[PDB]
Amino acid sequence: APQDPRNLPIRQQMEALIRRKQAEITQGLESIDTVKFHADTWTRGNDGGGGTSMVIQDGTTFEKGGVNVSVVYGQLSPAAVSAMKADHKNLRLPEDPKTGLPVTDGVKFFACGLSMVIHPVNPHAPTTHLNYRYFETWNQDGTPQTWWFGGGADLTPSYLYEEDGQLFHQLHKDALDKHDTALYPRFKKWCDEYFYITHRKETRGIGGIFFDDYDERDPQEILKMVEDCFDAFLPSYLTIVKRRKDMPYTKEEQQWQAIRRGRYVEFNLIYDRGTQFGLRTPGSRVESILMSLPEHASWLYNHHPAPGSREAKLLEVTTKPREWVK
Amino acid sequence: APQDPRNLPIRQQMEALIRRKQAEITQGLESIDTVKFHADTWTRGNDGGGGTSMVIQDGTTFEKGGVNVSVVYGQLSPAAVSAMKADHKNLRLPEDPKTGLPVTDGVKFFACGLSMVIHPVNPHAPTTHLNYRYFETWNQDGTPQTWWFGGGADLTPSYLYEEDGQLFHQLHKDALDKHDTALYPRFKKWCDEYFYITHRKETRGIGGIFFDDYDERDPQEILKMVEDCFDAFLPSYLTIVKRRKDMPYTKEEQQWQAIRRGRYVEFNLIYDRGTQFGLRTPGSRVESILMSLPEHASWLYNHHPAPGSREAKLLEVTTKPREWVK
C-alpha cells in the first residue's frame, strides 16, 4: 500500500512518472555508449516498498552510472528524520523517550523518487546528478500531515567549459520559466549552497537547480514542473558528453578527475541527505544508495593546482559560484 | 598556552612523549622503505594551538602514510562535542535564556595527540591506524573539569594472514598485560565494535585495541601504559610489512585492495569521531585530518567474492570477528 485516498492519485502518478523516465533516460544514455543498463529490483523487508536499480558499468563512454527508482513506505525512523528534508520542523511530536531523550518517535511516511549519478570515463566529460522525489507524512492517528517534492539536477566538471555550463543551466531555466520565472534564480542559488563541501570551502561542481520541501502549488502543477525538468537533462547532458567523450586527455587530467572524484565522495558521504536518508532507513539497498560513488577516486596530500591552470580555473568557480545563463 | 597548573605536567609530558614517538615511528617506517617523511608544522589560527603533520608518499613500501602530532586548545564548539568522546554527558551544561535554549555554549578545551594511518603499496601489506591522545576540559568558571586518554591501534588487511593478526594483537596484549591483564579483552572487543561499518555489516579490518574516555588510573600511570602501547606498534607492523611488502600481486588483488580502501573511506567519513572532531573544530588543518584517506579507492557495484575465495575469507572475519591470541 499505503491506501490513504486523499493524495493517492499524486502518489501513483509520480511513481509512474519516474518509472517512465527511468526507461527514457537509460535508453538515451545508452545511445552514446556501447553498453546497456542492467536491472535489479529489490524490496525493503516486506511491506516496506522497494525499488528498481538500473546500472551501467565499464562502458566506452560511461565508466559507472545508476538510475534508481525507489518507492518506500512505513515507520519513520528518528535516526533518518533530519535528512528527510531541509526543514525537519514542519512535522514533529514530543513523543517522550521513556528514560532521557526528547523530540521523535512513531510516524508513517511515504517517499517516491528517482536518483541518478553518471560518471564518464573521459576527464573532460562531466559527472552529473539528477533527482526528483515526492514525500508524504501522516500523523500517529493516521491523518495527513504534509507532503513535498524535491529534486533538481546539477553538473560536476573536472575541466570547465562555459558552453556546457551555459547549456545545462539554460535548459533547466527554460523548463522552470514555463512554470514561474522566479523559480530558477531561486533553485539555482540553492544548488550553489546545497552542494558546498563545507570543510573544503567549495562546491563539488557548478550546480544547476535544487529544490526541497516544495509544497507551493497544486501537487498536479508541481508534477508538470518535475516532468519538464526531467526533459531538460537529456538534451543538455547528451549534447555535452558527445562533444567531450573523445576530447584528448592525459594522465594528469585523469589524476585531477580522480581528485575531484574524491571531492565527490566526501560530499556524498558527509553532507548529502539523500545518502543519509537512505543509509538510515531500515531495509534500504546499500548497493543502490551507494551507486552514486565513482568506481575510482583519489586523495592527494595537500594538492594545489599550478596557478593559472585549468584545474585552478575550476577551483575559482567552485569557491565562488558564478552564473551561466542569459 | 594553557598554563593551568594542576595537570600542566601531564599535558607537557604527554606532549614530550608523542613527539618522541612521532620522530621514532617515522624513522622506523622510513627504514623499511626508501622514501622519507615530509614534515609540516601548522597553526590552528592563533592561540588555538597547532600541530606537526608528517606525510609519506610515493615510496616503495608505503603509498600514503601520515604521522600527525597535534597540540590543540581553546573554545569548544557545540558541534565538536559528540565526536570528542565515546560518552559526552560526563561534561553537561544548561543556561536558559528568555523562553529559549538551555544546553551549553562557552567552555574551554585542550587536546594533545598523535594520530597515524599507513597505507602500503602492496595489497598484501596491510593498512594500519594508531592514535594516542590526552584531552582536557575546564568549567565555565575556569576550574578543572576533566581529562581522559583515548587511543590504541588496529589492523586492516585486504588479504588475511593469521600470523599477522596474532602478532599484532599479541604485542598490544603484552603492552597492556603489564598494566592490567583485564584491559586487553576489554579494549579488543571495543576495537571490534567501534570500527564496524554499520551500513556494510562488517568492520573495516581485524581490529586490535581501542579505548576512549579513560581516566581509571592516575595520569602518570596511564602515560606509562600509553608508552608501552606505542612500543607494541613498530615491532609488529614493521615485521608484518617487511614480509608482505614483497609478496607478488595481481591486478585483481589490487582491485580488492581498492575495494577495501573504499570501505575504509566509508568508515572514516561516516563513523570515525577523530575525523569528525578535527573537521568540526574551527581552524584545524583539513589536509592533516584527511591524510588518513588512501591515495586511491574504488567502489564496484554489487561486488561479491567467489565462495571460498581468499577475498571471501576476509569477509568471514570482517562480518564476524574472532580471537588472535591463545
Curated annotation (Swiss-Prot), chains A, B:
Involved in the heme biosynthesis. Catalyzes the aerobic oxidative decarboxylation of propionate groups of rings A and B of coproporphyrinogen-III to yield the vinyl groups in protoporphyrinogen-IX. Pfam families: Coprogen_oxidas (PF01218). This is Oxygen-dependent coproporphyrinogen-III oxidase. It catalyses: coproporphyrinogen III + O2 + 2 H(+) = protoporphyrinogen IX + 2 CO2 + 2 H2O. It comes from Saccharomyces cerevisiae (strain ATCC 204508 / S288c). Homodimer. Present with 22000 molecules/cell in log phase SD medium. Its EC number is 1.3.3.3. It is an enzyme of class 1 (oxidoreductase). InterPro entries: Coprogen_oxidase_aer, Coprogen_oxidase_aer_sf, Coprogen_oxidase_CS. The lineage of its organism: Eukaryota, Fungi, Dikarya, Ascomycota, Saccharomycotina. Pathway: Porphyrin-containing compound metabolism; protoporphyrin-IX biosynthesis; protoporphyrinogen-IX from coproporphyrinogen-III (O2 route): step 1/1. Keywords: Cytoplasm, Disulfide bond, Heme biosynthesis, Oxidoreductase, Porphyrin biosynthesis. GO terms for cellular component: cytoplasm; cytosol. Belongs to the aerobic coproporphyrinogen-III oxidase family. One of its GO terms (molecular function) is protein homodimerization activity. The record marks H199 as: Important for dimerization. Optimum pH is 7.6. PROSITE patterns: COPROGEN_OXIDASE (PS01021).
